Design a protein around this nucleic acid. Sequence first.
RNA 1: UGAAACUCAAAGGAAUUGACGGGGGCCCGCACAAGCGGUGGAGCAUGUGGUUUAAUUCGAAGCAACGCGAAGAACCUUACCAGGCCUUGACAUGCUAGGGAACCCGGGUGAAAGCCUGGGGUGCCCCGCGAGGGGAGCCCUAGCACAGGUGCUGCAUGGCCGUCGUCAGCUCGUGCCGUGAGGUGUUGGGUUAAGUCCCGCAACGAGCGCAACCCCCGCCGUUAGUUGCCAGCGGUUCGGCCGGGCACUCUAACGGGACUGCCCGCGAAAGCGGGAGGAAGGAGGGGACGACGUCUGGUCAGCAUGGCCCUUACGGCCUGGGCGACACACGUGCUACAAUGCCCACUACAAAGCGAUGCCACCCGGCAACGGGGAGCUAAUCGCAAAAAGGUGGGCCCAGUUCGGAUUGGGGUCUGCAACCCGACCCCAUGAAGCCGGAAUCGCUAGUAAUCGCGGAUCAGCCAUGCCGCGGUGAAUACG
Lengths: 60, 95, 23, 206, 81, 155
Amino acid sequence: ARKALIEKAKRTPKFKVRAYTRCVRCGRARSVYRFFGLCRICLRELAHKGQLPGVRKASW
Amino acid sequence: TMNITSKQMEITPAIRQHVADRLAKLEKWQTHLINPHIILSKEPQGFVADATINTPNGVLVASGKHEDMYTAINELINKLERQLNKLQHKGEARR
Amino acid sequence: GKGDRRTRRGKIWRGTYGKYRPR
Amino acid sequence: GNKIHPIGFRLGITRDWESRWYAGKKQYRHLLLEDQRIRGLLEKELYSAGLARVDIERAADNVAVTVHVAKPGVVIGRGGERIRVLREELAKLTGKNVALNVQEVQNPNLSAPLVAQRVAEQIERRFAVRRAIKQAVQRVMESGAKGAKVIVSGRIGGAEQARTEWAAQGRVPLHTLRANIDYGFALARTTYGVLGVKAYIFLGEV
Amino acid sequence: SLKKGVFVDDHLLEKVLELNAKGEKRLIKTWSRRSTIVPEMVGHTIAVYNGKQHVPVYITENMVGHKLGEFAPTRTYRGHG
Amino acid sequence: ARRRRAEVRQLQPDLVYGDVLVTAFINKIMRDGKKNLAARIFYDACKIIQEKTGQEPLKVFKQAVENVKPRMEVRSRRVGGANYQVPMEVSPRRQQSLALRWLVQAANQRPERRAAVRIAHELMDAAEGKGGAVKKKEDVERMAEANRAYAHYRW
RNA sequence: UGAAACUCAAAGGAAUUGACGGGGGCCCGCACAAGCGGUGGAGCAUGUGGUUUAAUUCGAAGCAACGCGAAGAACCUUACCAGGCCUUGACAUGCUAGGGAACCCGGGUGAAAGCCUGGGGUGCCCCGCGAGGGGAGCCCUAGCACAGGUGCUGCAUGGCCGUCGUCAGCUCGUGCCGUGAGGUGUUGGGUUAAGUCCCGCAACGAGCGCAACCCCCGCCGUUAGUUGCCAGCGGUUCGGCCGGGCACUCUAACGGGACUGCCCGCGAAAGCGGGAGGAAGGAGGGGACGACGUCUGGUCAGCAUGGCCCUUACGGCCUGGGCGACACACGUGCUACAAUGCCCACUACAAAGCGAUGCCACCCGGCAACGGGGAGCUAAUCGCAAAAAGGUGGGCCCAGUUCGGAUUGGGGUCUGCAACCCGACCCCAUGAAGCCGGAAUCGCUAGUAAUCGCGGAUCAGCCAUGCCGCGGUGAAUACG
Ligand SMILES: [Mg+2]
Ligand SMILES: [Mg+2]
Ligand SMILES: [Mg+2]
Ligand SMILES: [Mg+2]
Ligand SMILES: [Mg+2]
Ligand SMILES: [Mg+2]
Ligand SMILES: [Mg+2]
Ligand SMILES: [Mg+2]
Ligand SMILES: [Mg+2]
Ligand SMILES: [Mg+2]
Ligand SMILES: [Mg+2]
Ligand SMILES: [Mg+2]
Ligand SMILES: [Mg+2]
Ligand SMILES: [Mg+2]
Ligand SMILES: [Mg+2]
Ligand SMILES: [Mg+2]
Ligand SMILES: [Mg+2]
Ligand SMILES: [Mg+2]
Ligand SMILES: [Mg+2]
Ligand SMILES: [Mg+2]
Ligand SMILES: [Mg+2]
Ligand SMILES: [Mg+2]
Ligand SMILES: [Mg+2]
Ligand SMILES: [Mg+2]
Ligand SMILES: [Mg+2]
Ligand SMILES: [Mg+2]
Ligand SMILES: [Mg+2]
Ligand SMILES: [Mg+2]
Ligand SMILES: [Mg+2]
Ligand SMILES: [Mg+2]
Ligand SMILES: [Mg+2]
Ligand SMILES: [Mg+2]
Ligand SMILES: [Mg+2]
Ligand SMILES: [Mg+2]
Ligand SMILES: [Mg+2]
Ligand SMILES: [Mg+2]
Ligand SMILES: [Mg+2]
Ligand SMILES: [Mg+2]
Ligand SMILES: [Mg+2]
Ligand SMILES: [Mg+2]
Ligand SMILES: [Mg+2]
Ligand SMILES: [Mg+2]
Ligand SMILES: [Mg+2]
Ligand SMILES: [Mg+2]
Ligand SMILES: [Mg+2]
Ligand SMILES: [Mg+2]
Ligand SMILES: [Zn+2]
């Protein structure tokens, strides 16, 4: 049970409870961000790459 | 009390009490053995036995490694004994 | 106290309102 | 197993973003998810071009989609035909106004992504890895830089035991906030497995 | 818990208000542990799923507000030692 | 303190008697940062220090502090196979710190229900030479003395 | 004086770079000491070892595994178990033999999945006034070629991370020394947070690390004002409310200021002590950053990837169970054992954030959770909002208590298709252990520990006492 999984989260099934964020890049269910569409890993890779608009290493 | 972790392996009540029995050798020194923890583990070369134990005079840590699991465990106790006799006799150089 | 649902301080910790910590 | 990404570490300082725009909550995800489809479409198709970096802009139903490159030819083509076959397919997914763009890169051997994917393809090509690495640095320093560093890791020359190969000339001070260090990464899938390549180019102080 | 509505699946609901109508039988197999025991069920043998087995429960007016699952428990325990 | 010497902070003098020794004390009464609390106790006690035994609560306080500060104490070294309790003089720094500490500590063991009373009474008695604190002093001091002959192992 | 059998792939000498010593010298770090608060005992929450189970999926393992992967396990998640189903597949590209396409709705049936089934009818390039027609959007069936696999190996791997360690180190070039490994430099004296810097020197330089360049805070300047203001007057329904103003406060962008630069003192210098001015001095405090390398560290279960393995099954859909089981054992934490406290009622003072099928003012029903209505706000202009400890004054009077709130009975609310297993909250009744904790053991040097509340991610709800942030009050001590 893996790639079939990412497909199963696409078309929205019987009840709306069954809604769960997966992520676009990796099929990761765990630690997906709503704002990015991303997991915490994928998020990191992209941010560091400079591909996330106005996203910067924080530091205060 | 004493805890044993068989990591990625199917262990048994019988061999568990065997390791409890081999560790009993350190009871010889008559010094409190506090929450001892052994970990048995496979490996392509052979088994691995680790243990980490604290005592009133310090802590014991050591790894046995060997083809036979039992000789790995023995090796582990052999290494532990040394460490224990050292914590017990070390400052006697008190001249 | 902080664990006792029936008190003010109780509800504050628990983050709720009721008879004992009203709105 | 320690080092911070030298691009991410300078975002806003020496270096700047490759997708530049503004959104806010309701549509960010989507905007963004577009870019990364665009990026995939491009990086695949536009592979043997060269390049490094794709800057991207947005206003409304307007994607500027800039592409810097090694040899612009494989984009523009004969009379500027294929530039348009792409300006199409982008737009087909973009569902909005695409502008396919080509900027040429100056000394493609001064660019990090570009130098690293050369040694990369050279490794897939079964070359002495240690020598491939000295050279790829040699080329950079010859065409100028204030220093240069290059890293391959994996079954180098196919060795059962993994190994990691390392070479550098001149300065590469990755602790300095104004480095202008261009860093880029490629990947060599060989008959035996994957090897990582990292290049570092010290262009100078800002 | 569960304020206004009385929840029975309207799948075993149907089954009980039919069997009662013509000549009332037994052996209704269900996997719904979520179903309340509604007074129209009072007396029957329903076969309830705990997940490896369909466990039969005679219904009695002793137990109504409950759920059909409560009487076919999910864990086999027996002890320690 | 491997490196240099460890600064002793000075302290804001208090807003009633304008004297550092009181705040240090109030600091020692304090619990979980609640300083306002730590204040009223001392002062309330000061009400009581005047009320009963009419006098100058400042005077009483500052007296029972000098009646507590230990002049000599033991600090134990390992030599050979035995740990010797060793006689050494306490710094004025340490005496203050030991003064205030035992005072409070012994105060809070009194049977009086209200904290400030406990503080009141312990101080009144220490002024006079009676109490848990004072004992601890005399005690520490007889434990020095009797070790007088370990005064050579002294740093 | 002096063998042999047998046996071994060595036994050795000197020197080298390390590691180590219950060897030495010097020197750092909450390493110890000084000191304040905990843990270990209690009840409960949470992970883990076990055992249990049809299954209790999986990984993580001394420090560096154990509120870790999980920044949200009722279904979903979900990788496991039981039963019911599907095969060219839930999914990619391509080729064909029939039909058709597209699309929306019931039915019969079943727990659902699935199986069986009654409908309407395709624009289009189009011989067309016609039957009809060709194509190809797109569906199906049949057939493949294939897909798919959270199946195995983190010692075959990339990538990213933990760690020694913010420790002061690790090296290269040429030269010199040694047959050589290798030395030198990098050592030495002195100083620094520092291979920091000074002075020596068969060495002279260079690089990766230190520092600095970046962010936050503290002081001042500018630019700027639908936030702030009787600072100013006027009005003032009394709300900075209107007028009016940017002085304030602020907000958020760009500057300035700290340099051991100045005085004394010492030194050969680097630099140490002391002084002045300054909001701030000796790295002003906090952050981001973490060398060559180590742990055959960690992850094939985020992703990727070699290789091995399964192809009506190790693939795929579903209903249900499980991941929450409980004789036990450990780890992290919550709330406590009370009077420096507990309870009631009135009354103050933040910061950072977050809000459109969201944040809900206010009105009403309700003891209440909540439920009705209902205004504002794409938000410095509305809302979450109450901050809490504190302040006031009243009760409690040392009692297992007006301490503590576990456990259980019963009655309700809300989310959700559904709260048996298994949610959170509210009310009534019940008020367990616990009187400060053995051996042992953790954190913290100042706006810190302790204590007090607030926000956020993830999220229908939530098992958050977790985590990441934010301010409030605010100590003790450091000989060494
Ligand atoms: Mg959900
Ligand atoms: Mg109570
Ligand atoms: Mg409390
Ligand atoms: Mg010899
Ligand atoms: Mg030798
Ligand atoms: Mg030594
Ligand atoms: Mg010597
Ligand atoms: Mg200590
Ligand atoms: Mg203590
Ligand atoms: Mg305890
Ligand atoms: Mg406990
Ligand atoms: Mg695994
Ligand atoms: Mg180890
Ligand atoms: Mg959770
Ligand atoms: Mg499940
Ligand atoms: Mg039916
Ligand atoms: Mg590894
Ligand atoms: Mg790895
Ligand atoms: Mg492993
Ligand atoms: Mg030579
Ligand atoms: Mg050499
Ligand atoms: Mg060295
Ligand atoms: Mg340092
Ligand atoms: Mg240097
Ligand atoms: Mg203005
Ligand atoms: Mg101005
Ligand atoms: Mg730095
Ligand atoms: Mg390993
Ligand atoms: Mg994988
Ligand atoms: Mg092969
Ligand atoms: Mg399922
Ligand atoms: Mg779990
Ligand atoms: Mg225990
Ligand atoms: Mg907890
Ligand atoms: Mg507004
Ligand atoms: Mg009782
Ligand atoms: Mg009571
Ligand atoms: Mg309860
Ligand atoms: Mg009940
Ligand atoms: Mg009792
Ligand atoms: Mg008592
Ligand atoms: Mg204690
Ligand atoms: Mg306490
Ligand atoms: Mg410190
Ligand atoms: Mg929530
Ligand atoms: Mg919270
Ligand atoms: Zn992802």
